[PDB]
Structure formats: C-alpha cells, structure tokens
Amino acid sequence: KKPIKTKFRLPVFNWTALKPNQINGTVFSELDDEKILEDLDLDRFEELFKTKAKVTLLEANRAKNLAITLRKAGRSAEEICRAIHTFDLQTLPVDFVECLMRFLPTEAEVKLLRQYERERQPLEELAAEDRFMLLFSKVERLTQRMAGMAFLGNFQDNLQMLTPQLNAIIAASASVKSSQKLKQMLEIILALGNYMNSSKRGAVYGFKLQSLDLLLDTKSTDRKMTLLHFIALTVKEKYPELANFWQELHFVEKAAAVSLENVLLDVKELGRGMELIRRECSIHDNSVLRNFLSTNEGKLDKLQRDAKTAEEAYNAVVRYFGESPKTTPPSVFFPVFVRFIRSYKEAEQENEARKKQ
C-alpha cells in the first residue's frame, strides 16, 4: 500500500526489492517510512536529485535476421522463388543462396503458415517476412533445389582449389619417391653414420626419416663445421653431380601444406552432390541442370581419378620411407625434406664462404 507523491520524477533507484512475503522474517519489518515523513525534508531532496520531465508468425529474432538478409538481396519473394524453381537462371548469386539456406522454414513454422493461409485472410495483413516464408515453403522440393544451387555455384571454385593440392601431392610425392640423387644422399648418410655408430650399438640397414633433422646437430671436434657441412664437402669432392639433387624433387613445400584427408573427403562429398544434381535433373527440371551436368561430369571424373592416384601415390612414398601414411600426413612427412634441403643449401653457402678465406 501507500506510494508517495513525486513532484519532479526522481531517478529510478535500481535496488532489488524484497517481496512482502519474504519481508516478515527480516529486519525490514521492524519499523517503517511512517516515521520519516517530513523529517529529512523531502523538498531539498527532490530539488537536489530532480531529472528532466501487421502480425508475425515467425519468432521476432528469426524475423529480424531474415529481413537483414533480404534487404541486402533486393529481390522479391516471387523473384526468389522463381529463381529457385528455374535454378537461379535468373541471376545466380551463390552467396545469397548460402545465406538464405539457413532460413529454410522448419516444419514447426510451416504449421503456423499452412492452414492459416486458407483460414481467415492474413494476406496483406501478414508481415513481409511471413508472406515471404509462406511463398518460400510454396516451392516444391525447396531443400534439395537449394542444395543443388549451392553445389552448382560452388563446383568451379571448388575444383579450382581442390585440383592443385591433389596435383601438388602427386607431383611432390613422386619426384621424391623417384629421385635417385636423393636415394644416393641417403645412402651416403647411412654409410657415414653407420661408421660412427658401429663397433658398439651394432650396424643398421636404414633409418627412420626424423633422423635427417639431427645432422646439423653433431658437430666437428673443431666445433667449426657440422656433419652436414662435411657431407657437403664430401659431395662436392667425391660426388659432384649430387651437389644439386634437390632439383629432382618439386612440389614438396606446397605438398607439405596440403591437408589431404580433407581433400579426399571433399572429393567424396562433391560426388554425393553431383548425384543429387542428376537425381533432381532426372525427375525433373530439366533446363540448365543438364547444361551443367554434361559440361561437368567429366571434370568431376578427372578430379576423382586424380584423387585415387593422389592417395595411392602418397601412401606409396610414406611406406617407402618407413613411416605410416595412416599415422602421418604430408604436413609432417614433407617438411622433413624441406628442412633438409633448406639446410643443405644453407650448408654449402658456409662451406663456400669458408674456402674463400
């Protein structure tokens, strides 16, 4: 009961207040504001503290979002559904197809639209967004036509990015696997370090690839050169043709950076997508789906035979150097060589500049 007068509008005090059912057990029912009437002199208080005196069926957020999307579009709901029917043979804007795809109606909000079209007349009393959604769910096979359109606009840029990775693994995997000037270098190492490592510890017929990395590691007693330096001098002297030998392997840096497992499953996904395109085009479009599928299915096939040979090639090298392609990616495998080449190259610069003075 009993609120106050408020001549001026005092600032809200944002305190979190206690409901009177809590009030009973506390200090707060002991005594009250009934003593405090004039008292403190409310007047200079209030003089000191004074301040200056259609319908949506979509949840409002989803609505706002949609609006922000379509505002950017510029297209009418009708233009849009026409485009999805014709497969964006009216201005295919894949970006916009992508954004839109999230706004596909859920069956739950298909319910709010469905009979409530026939029932009453929300039409023209419907919010723009709701009307759009109505006509949007009107499109037959909406989900799949969307998917198809996405696929289509993407495919070019897709194998634009997918191909050269597949190529760079293929290239590098083989140029490494097939280099003699490499197998030679390795065999000199096997020698030299077996010489070192023998008389104790045994003698061994080959080494796992990690080994290459500690080369710069074990120095001369002089401390002035390294082992790698030595292998370099020994190359320039006893085996001069090898002094290049890196030039026989090629895309190794670029193939390092390829994440292949991904590339493969991307290829597989593309496959399922083409299948959707042919399944849809079948029964039935048929315009510009055919006009795609023809000019494409062979491109896709090239990507697939290149995926199969990329995978086989790479598994081949890894197993060839002792490691497990199941457990190792290029992102590990190839840099080993990279580091070794880069270093070797670095080594001879010193082996050269030392000979000069």
Partner: protein, 356 residues
Amino acid sequence: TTALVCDNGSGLVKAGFAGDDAPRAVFPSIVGRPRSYVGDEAQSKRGILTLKYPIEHGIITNWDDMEKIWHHTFYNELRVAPEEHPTLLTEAPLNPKANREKMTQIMFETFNVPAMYVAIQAVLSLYASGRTTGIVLDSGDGVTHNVPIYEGYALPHAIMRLDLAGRDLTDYLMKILTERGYSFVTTAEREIVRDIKEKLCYVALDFENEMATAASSSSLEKSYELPDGQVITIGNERFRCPETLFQPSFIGMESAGIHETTYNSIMKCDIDIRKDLYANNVMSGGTTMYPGIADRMQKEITALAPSTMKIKIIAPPERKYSVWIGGSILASLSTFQQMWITKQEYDEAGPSIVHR
C-alpha cells in the same frame, strides 16, 4: 518519426538520422574542462582546458563527460529535440550490463527520449553487409575486437579485445617519421601526421619482400604536400606503420597480431559454426581502411586454416562507418520496431529492462 543513431567511438562519435546514408555528425569524442566544451572545439581550445576521454579504449568510463557528449550530439551537431526521436546507441563488445543499464537510464532520464536501443557495434557492422553470422574484425581508433556472431548473437567468450588501434598507429608513424628525420613530435601539428596515414600508407602483402624494395623503386615512396607551402616525402615507413597490426611487437606488445586474434577467436567457437565464420568475415572501421589489408589478412588466415577451408574477407568500400550504417539499417528496419525500449516499459521495469 525519424529515429536517431549514435555510435560512440573510442575516438569518434559517429551519429545522425536513420534511413541509411552516413552519419552527418562525426566529431572527436573528447571533453574539455577549465583548468564545458565538447568535440573539435575542445581540440581548438586545447591546453586552456584539460581534455578528458570518456570512451577511450572500449567502454564509457566517466559518465558525466558522456552526458556532455550526448548533449552536444543532440543539441548541436544533430540539431534536434531528443524528446522526439527514438535513439539507437552502440556499445563495445563485452560491455557490462551496468554500463548498458546506465546508458539507458541517461537516455530516458536526462534526454527524455521516447524510445531507445543499445546495440553491439560489431553486430551492426555485420548487419550492414547483409549477414547474421560471421566474425567481425572491428578496428577503431582506440580498441580492436574479433567478434564472433551466430544468428545475430555475438558469442560472448570468443570476443578478443586487442588494445591496439588507429591512435596507436598514428603514434607509430610519429616515431618512425622522426627516425627518418622529420621534425614533428608536437601534440598539435601531429594532426597532419594522421592525415598521411589516412591518405597514402598501406598494408604490405609480404612484409620483408616489400621492405626488400626499401630503396629500389622511387615510385614505391610517395610525395606528401604539407598544408602550407613546404612539401616532404614518405619512404618505407609508409607500409611499415599498418604492419603493427599484424606485428604488435613493433610498438612492443606481447599480444597476437590480427590474423591470430581472428583465428583463435574462431577457434574458441563451436566446431560446427567455424566454417560459416571463416567464410563470412567482415572487416569494419577506419583502421580496417588501409588498402590491401583484406588480401593480406586473407592469405594470413588461409595459412592458419586447413587446405580446403572456404575463407572470405568482406571489406566494404563504405566500412569506415560500417556499424553506424548497420545502425540505420536496423533502426529503419521494420521488424526492429517491436524491440525498441520505451519510457512506458522503462518506467515499468527500470533500466534492467534493457536486457532482451
């Protein structure tokens, strides 16, 4: 009723009327006081007054000066009667619910506004590009953020606040033009140095590669004309300044550069939406203005992400004002209308109504 849109920037108030074009009232957010005056006027009367900086870094700190700001915004630049127009103000990411709550309270109680809204700047920027999901790099005068957003909602623990920004880059250009022999350390005439930064200098695609060209090309360096008669020239320091973004270490920071900040921001987020985040990546604000910054960014992220990752940088030609336009767009938006706060409901619930 034209609504109002006020973007309160670490260095700059960008404000005006909804119905999107651009803020026509844009002034330095500064408050002068006798040892009150607001804006460029304070720049002029400088030193006779002590300038206080309410919005420096992210958040409005001292509110009194802020009141001075909004008063000058409304009553002078904008030249309106705040009682009349519903007002939309922006807010930094991670802005605390009380900052927001006292914003609303100052709105309704001090300026008597009919309705209002407080919106998160980097979400407005993402709105102005026609997107409800993605990661904004909003880089202003005083702060920088990487704000992940999903279905309009900015993901709270994703946001990465870098304390580096445009004013700091202006300082760096001071430091490195001095090292080239040029004579202005002056806190007055440095207002021209900023201009150089804005007109000429840029972001290298490969830093050292371009600093290998340090003296090679004469047309790599550019000719700058001072306001008065004399003219000077700018060398490598040109591209060396915005580099401080990607290498914060230049000024001496142990914080990640941008691409990193961006990256582990994305990486803080749920695995599913990551894809949509890389794909839609929007740069906004006047420090994202340097030419070529988009592509440099692009290559630098393509680096950190996987091979097959679809990575797109959206850097709109109008993005200096991105947030504000996303503001107009939102205020003028029709389905936004039911979301406005009003005096009716503030007087009902008090300032903690501001939560939606």
